[PDB]
Design a protein around this ligand. Structure first.
Ligand SMILES: CCCCCCCCCCCCCCCCCC(=O)OC[C@H](COP(=O)([O-])OCC(O)COP(=O)([O-])OC[C@@H](COC(=O)CCCCCCCCCCCCCCCCC)OC(=O)CCCCCCCCCCCCCCCCC)OC(=O)CCCCCCCCCCCCCCCCC
Ligand SMILES: CCCCCCCCCCCCCCCCCC(=O)OC[C@H](COP(=O)([O-])OCC[N+](C)(C)C)OC(=O)CCCCCCCCCCCCCCCCC
Ligand SMILES: CCCCCCCCCCCCCCCCCCCC(=O)O[C@H](COC(=O)CCCCCCCCCCCCCC)COP(=O)(O)OCCN
Ligand SMILES: CCCCCCCCCCCCCCCCCCCC(=O)O[C@H](COC(=O)CCCCCCCCCCCCCC)COP(=O)(O)OCCN
Ligand code: HEC
Ligand code: HEC
Ligand code: HEM
Ligand code: HEM
Ligand SMILES: CCCCCC[C@H]1C(=O)O[C@H](C)[C@H](NC(=O)c2cccc(NC=O)c2O)C(=O)O[C@@H](C)[C@@H]1OC(=O)CC(C)C
Ligand code: FES
Lengths: 244, 111, 54, 383, 85, 244, 54, 85
């Protein structure tokens, strides 16, 4: 296919979490959550993440409960069977900006902003793709590209025409930790955040893998000693033949 | 007042019982009770009656404050529960079950 | 060192008991050692490192 | 040399189903083995089919079973066949065990097939209990609640174990999904053990109703027992047809057609009929832990028959006193069954305790006494 | 303990002559009427006691128990029920 | 237990469908549907039955479509993602009188009228129980029964006090076929209808069972001939022994 | 009657072919026969009997 | 075709003496360095062609195909692509 049809393949950036021994930077994850909440959440849902998931990753229990309690969720009906709302709890899922697909598409000139809970695993490239995409809107589309109406040019997106406009501009977010909120900083943070959302066990997984690698390496070394020890009678065997 | 908290779909009655209510409950001789228990066995704190607000008969939810022993009245088959939430009159065999609840703070309980 | 053999290895019951006790100790110490090592190579990155701000 | 003997694969089939040497005098009670194999095949066929239509999520399980009954072509048949064949499986298994006890199939040299058999019996109980839960009707739920709360009586760890099996603090969605997976698996484990008890039996061959050696007079398994097994297959399928097509709910409990409701407790929680004797044994002991141990012991005690039968003669065909004792044992086992489904009221409470003592005393006292006395009577009587 | 055809583990047999006829030469239903009536009567009569005694005893037990239970939960049986609890 | 606590056990009535060879009377089923629709449906749902299930049992396709098309059901949202209703189709399920349990109980002085799709299989007794219950409200409760308020005495119901009032009175329905709508006639019809609802395969099941009974009977007879034929060599064997 | 044996029974290929053809015919005729029988014993009861009113 | 210990189906063996020492009497790692270096070199050298020839050929094929494909879907390759379809 033409490279246009595939999309430009994203650069390999050195993410903090790349590397067999490396966790996420949780301060980046927290910054990234703030980007999601102030920018992406306007159009994109994060349906697979519950408030409880942020606790002990990005937020304390109190901060997360505060976020949950600011929202209203559907309760069980009252005693007259009339519908009711309740304040959110830690077990609640982070709510979407739209009630259904149709509402979502109507607000986005037909395009459906996907759920971002898995988007880091659901695209070739992962964090690098998300970072590349958000930072890769050129000021001007390459001369001679024909964009459909309501499309924006982005070379990393397959086909080139994406229904999502550039959204990150210097200082759209005010980070609470005093980090300069540059386009690239915000994209790095939110891309890290979304990667965590897709794979929240990532830190635990790689620690257990370190333990497993060490034990299995030792057992591999020892298994070879034991095999050679038990086989030495057979390898060392000699014959003396006297034809009868 | 009696609150109704859903907890695993089942309703939880939490009543903030007054002094005179506690007194009324501490009267009934244990002897004459389908399910013999005293309020002290039921509550871990006399000001916090916490029960699973499902009637022990079939499994309707009693309307509180109503009754004949002025606690809870199941309207379904007309079983009357007490201020301890003990069964007094009607088809129900047992007293309204008590969940495992703990006072983490004096102002918050977990169920 | 004959003594060592006679006590811990000669009887299989003793050998297996020694293996399992060693496994218990290894398991416990290795867990603790990995935990500390993991915290040093990922310093300032984990929640426990930023939690103090909150 | 004939292909069926030459080829290693064919030879194994040959050794079990064709040239297998059998005693020439096996009576109709030797046919329950093949009926249990037929039940196991029907349960696999119907079970796998139901699994293609069932959804293990608790919000949908009961509805998926209604979907099977109402929407799936022949769904009604596959569901009722599976549910009723579970009853027939236990009729056949009790018959097969009864035959083995009466004819002394548990004695040397067949202690091994017998002992594996006792494990098959345990797996069948577990299999059928879990399958019952999958419907997620009221009997499903309240059965899983009560039965898994017995495990709470295991000291110290019991509570933790229960919550671990449920996957939660009560019977709910996690429990249902895990029972689905296990109920799918357990029948394959059961089939493997069924095959192991046969392989174990192959060393001694089948016992026979006279309890003597059959080494003197053998008959190929096919065609003689092949065609004899067809008679009981057709008799079984006639009984199956009467239940499945004409009275599909006669063996069941209507309460399981009410969706599970953790609030409402059903009028009476009684297990499926085939568990009832064990349930009566459990109720007989007032202590919770005692009751559970007794209930498990009621099954495991079968493993001591090889020890407590002290007879020099295999089986009961020739032992009039043992036959009377066995008749009393079997009738008591049925009375236990009936006491499992009455209410916990006088005078059935005391009666259940008497029947439970009689059940255990058969293995521990009466069979050892009676078999010792009959030894002496045979010898003195024939001098 | 059990062998296979040709070394089954029978003590040596000698001097038994066994004879039989083909299934196609025999009447498979020969004397079925006689057997169904007289043979089944003989075999049933010989085993009747071993079934009838335990069944009749346990049926009587159940009957007594179910009748007592029924009577205890009547108005007439209120007092006897009160003592039994 | 007391007989009161169990409920009186219902008589065995000779239903048309009792009998290995008997189907439901479909004219009774149709009459019973009309009773359900005009009396029971006020409080009880029939959630497991779709309009398509009545077709070729009680109604023609046209009559059933007419019933479906009179109702409104939830459609997929419109293009602005606003909720919408549509007219019913044959694949729709017969809708309940209440949106949820709470609404149902509030309308019935706390009692929850159960769904009737399975009630004939979900009670000991089946059709006989439903018939007995609906016809078994005495004019006066037996002297000395204390009914709780909002309870009605009915001996067939376990405990005696049922939250459902007597509902069938002579001429509450006007049958379209000119059958006199007496209490007993209506109870017979509606009980038949509910039995069909619980087991809609009943007619097919019993016809296939007739076929199965016949084939399996013949095969049983033949299997015995064949077994005796193949076994005759063994049964007929005779011995002559000459001690060596 | 030797002829009958020789044609349909002697060769197993022929016997099995005869059995399967018989099974086909039995299946078809038995279906039809049961259908008619079932309709007569349940006369005026089934949908097909009342359908004419509509 | 294969028997079991004691009747394996070997032609009769005679006059072979086999000797070995205990695993505890041997160094299991004796001459490991020599083998790891010299023996592995020998064995690899002897088999190298059977791997290198097919792998190098199929790698070259793939390389030619992937480079052509890439070139056909450029601007420069428009005409050659048009003919190829
Ligand atoms: C369930 C699924 C359906 C499948 C059908 C399987 C059931 C077949 C089976 O094993 O039982 C048939 C079985 C027939 O087996 P058989 O090979 O004819 O004889 C086995 C005994 O040796 C027969 O013992 P016998 O030779 O001493 O004859 C005894 C039998 C008469 O046996 C019959 O032929 C009947 O009569 C009775 O004991 C009747 C009891 C009297 C009460 C009245 O009937 C009984 O033995 C019934 C007695 C059991 C108590
Ligand atoms: C019900 C009570 C059963 C009593 C049976 C006593 C023997 C009898 O008369 O049976 C006839 C026959 C007697 O057969 P038999 O082999 O003893 O005698 C044949 C005839 N002679 C003596 C000439 C060789 O017994 C059986 O066939 C008994 C099989 C037992 C099956 C029991 C199933 C119960 C499930 C409980 C599971 C735990
Ligand atoms: C279920 C359906 C039953 C099987 C129907 C098969 C048709 C039977 C007719 C065929 C027949 O009699 O010929 C024999 C086939 O039997 C056979 O080869 C099979 C014999 C009987 C099959 C069943 C064996 C045990 C059944 C019980 C079930 C087992 C539990 C597992 C679910 C040939 O054989 P022959 O040697 O008599 O021929 C003598 C000459 N060549
Ligand atoms: C798996 C479960 C096995 C249980 C079988 C019991 C009967 C189920 C058959 C279904 C049924 O209702 O069939 C009826 C006839 O029964 C019959 O005639 C069937 C009874 C005959 C006994 C079984 C003989 C072999 C069956 C097992 C073989 C399966 C796999 C091997 C290839 C009528 O249905 P219908 O006549 O309308 O049907 C359309 C063809 N006209
Ligand atoms: C006001 C609208 C809007 C905002 C703000 C927005 N998006 Fe999107 N986004 C979209 C739409 C519409 C699409 C789908 C575009 C398409 O399929 O043409 C989309 C697509 C995406 C995709 C997937 C592209 C693919 O390969 O399918 C990612 C990843 C993404 N957005 C992330 C973000 C992140 C991260 C932010 C902000 C930090 C963000 N979006 C802000 C509307 C938005
Ligand atoms: C206006 C209310 C109302 C009407 C009309 C009504 N029911 Fe009910 N029904 C109830 C309530 C409430 C219950 C539950 C009673 C209880 O649990 O105490 C109930 C229970 C039942 C039960 C189950 C009783 C049990 O065993 O649990 C059946 C069967 C039943 N109704 C059938 C019908 C039929 C058939 C009709 C009319 C043809 C009907 N009902 C009309 C309110 C109604
Ligand atoms: C799926 C369950 C089972 C299947 C399919 C099965 C099948 C069979 C079969 C086919 C035989 C040989 C034929 C026969 O005697 O009937 C047999 C024999 C036997 N079975 Fe079972 N069996 C099962 C369960 C059990 C159980 C629960 C027990 C014991 C508790 C048991 C104990 C035996 C014994 C001892 C024999 C040898 C009896 C003898 O021939 O003398 N089996 N079984
Ligand atoms: C020994 C084998 C088996 C036994 C004794 C058994 C028993 C049961 C029982 C008793 C039920 C409850 C039936 C009811 O009342 O509806 C059931 C349900 C079920 N079984 Fe099995 N079963 C067996 C094998 C299998 C197998 C192999 C499967 C393969 C998945 C399976 C799948 C199911 C399913 C999906 C249900 C739920 C649907 C239903 O209730 O009908 N079963 N089983
Ligand atoms: C096909 C070859 C694979 C070997 C295993 C298949 C089955 C097999 O061996 O069949 C045999 C026919 C066997 N019957 C007997 O032993 C038997 C012996 C003597 C008398 C009678 N009856 C009297 O008249 C018998 O019925 C039987 O039904 O046992 C099944 C359970 C076996 O299934 C398995 O274990 C595997 C799995 C499906 C449980
Ligand atoms: S359901 Fe509570 S009174 Fe009967």
């Amino acid at each position: 296919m033409t490279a246009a049809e595939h999309g430009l393949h994203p650069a390999e950036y050195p993410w903090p979490q790349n590397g067999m021994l490396s966790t996420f930077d949780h301060a980046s994850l927290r910054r990234g959550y703030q980007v999601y909440k102030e920018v992406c959440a306007a159009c994109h849902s994060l349906d697979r993440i519950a408030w409880r998931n942020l606790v002990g990753v990005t937020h304390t229990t109190d901060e997360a409960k505060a976020f949950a309690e600011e929202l209203e969720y559907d309760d069980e009906p009252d005693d007259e069977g009339n519908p009711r709302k309740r304040p959110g709890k830690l077990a609640d899922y982070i709510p979407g900006p739209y009630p259904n697909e149709q509402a979502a598409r109507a607000a986005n000139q037909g395009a459906l902003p996907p759920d971002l809970s898995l988007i880091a695993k659901a695209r070739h490239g992962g964090a690098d793709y998300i970072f590349a995409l958000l930072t890769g809107y050129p000021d001007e589309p390459p001369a001679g590209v024909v964009l459909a109406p309501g499309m924006n040019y982005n070379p990393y997106f397959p086909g080139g025409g994406i229904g999502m406009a550039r959204t990150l501009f210097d200082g759209v977010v005010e980070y609470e930790d005093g980090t300069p909120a540059t386009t690239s900083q915000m994209a790095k943070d939110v891309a890290a955040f979304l990667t965590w959302a897709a794979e929240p066990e990532h830190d635990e997984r790689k620690k257990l893998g370190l333990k497993a690698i060490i034990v299995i390496s030792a057992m591999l070394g020892l298994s070879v000693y034991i095999k050679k020890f038990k086989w030495s009678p057979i390898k060392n065997r000699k014959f003396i033949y006297n034809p009868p | 007042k009696n609150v109704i908290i859903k907890w695993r779909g089942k309703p939880i009655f939490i009543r903030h019982r007054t002094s005179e209510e506690i007194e009324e409950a501490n009267e009934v001789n244990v002897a004459t009770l389908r399910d013999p228990q005293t309020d002290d066995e039921r509550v871990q704190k006399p000001e916090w009656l916490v029960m699973i607000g499902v009637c022990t008969h079939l499994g309707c939810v009693p309307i509180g404050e109503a009754g004949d022993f002025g606690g809870w009245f199941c309207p379904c088959h007309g079983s009357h529960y007490d201020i301890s939430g003990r069964i007094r009159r009607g088809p129900a065999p047992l007293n309204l079950e008590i969940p495992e609840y703990d006072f983490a703070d004096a102002e918050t309980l977990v169920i | 060192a004959t003594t060592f053999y006679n006590v811990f290895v000669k009887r299989n019951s003793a050998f297996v008991a020694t293996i399992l006790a060693s496994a218990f100790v290894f398991d416990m110490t290795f867990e603790t050692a990995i935990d500390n090592f993991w915290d040093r190579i990922n310093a300032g990155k984990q929640w426990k490192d930023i939690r103090h701000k909150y | 040399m004939a292909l069926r003997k030459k080829n290693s694969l064919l030879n194994m089939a040959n050794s079990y189903v064709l040239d297998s040497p059998q005693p020439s005098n096996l009576n109709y009670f030797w046919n329950f083995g093949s009926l249990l194999a037929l039940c196991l095949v029907i349960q696999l066929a119907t079970g796998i089919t139901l699994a293609m239509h069932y959804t293990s999520h608790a919000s949908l399980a009961f509805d998926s079973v209604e979907h099977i009954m109402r929407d799936v072509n022949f769904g009604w048949f596959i569901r009722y066949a599976h549910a009723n064949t579970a009853s027939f499986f236990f009729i056949c298994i009790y018959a097969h065990m009864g035959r083995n006890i009466y004819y002394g199939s548990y004695k040397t040299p067949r202690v091994l097939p017998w002992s594996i058999g006792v494990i098959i019996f345990l797996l069948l109980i577990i299999t059928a209990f879990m399958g019952y839960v999958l419907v997620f009707g009221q009997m499903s739920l309240w059965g899983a609640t009560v039965i898994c709360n017995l495990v709470s009586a295991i000291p110290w760890l019991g509570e933790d174990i229960v919550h671990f099996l449920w996957g939660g603090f009560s019977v709910g969605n996690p429990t249902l999904q895990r029972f689905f997976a296990l109920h799918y698996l357990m029948p394959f484990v059961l089939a493997v053990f069924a095959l192991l008890h046969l392989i174990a039996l192959h060393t001694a061959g089948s016992s026979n109703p006279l309890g003597i050696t059959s080494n003197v007079d053998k008959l190929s398994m096919h065609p003689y027992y092949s065609f004899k097994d067809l008679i009981t297959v057709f008799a079984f399928l006639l009984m199956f047809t009467l239940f499945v097509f004409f009275s599909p709910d006669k063996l069941g409990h209507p309460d399981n057609y009410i969706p599970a409701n953790p609030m409402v407790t059903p009028a009476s929680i009684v297990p499926e009929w085939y568990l009832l004797p064990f349930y009566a044994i459990l109720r007989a002991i007032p202590d919770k832990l005692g009751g559970v141990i007794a209930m498990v012991a009621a099954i495991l005690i079968l493993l001591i028959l090889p020890i407590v039968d002290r007879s020099i003669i295999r089986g009961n065909a020739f032992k009039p006193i043992s036959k009377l004792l066995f008749g009393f044992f079997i009738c008591n086992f049925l009375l236990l069954g009936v006491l499992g489904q009455v209410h916990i009221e006088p005078p059935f409470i005391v009666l259940g305790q008497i029947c439970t003592i009689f059940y255990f005393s058969y293995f521990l006292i009466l069979l050892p006494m009676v078999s010792t006395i009959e030894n002496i009577f045979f010898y003195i009587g024939s001098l | 303990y059990m062998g296979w055809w040709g070394h089954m583990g029978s003590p040596p047999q000698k001097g038994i002559a066994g004879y039989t006829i083909s299934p196609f030469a025999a009447r498979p239903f020969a004397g079925v009427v006689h057997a169904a009536i007289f043979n089944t009567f003989r075999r049933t009569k010989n085993q009747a006691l071993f079934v009838i005694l335990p069944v009749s005893f346990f049926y009587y037990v159940w009957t007594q128990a179910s009748e007592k239970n029924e009577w205890l939960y009547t108005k007439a049986g209120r007092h006897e029920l009160a003592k039994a609890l």
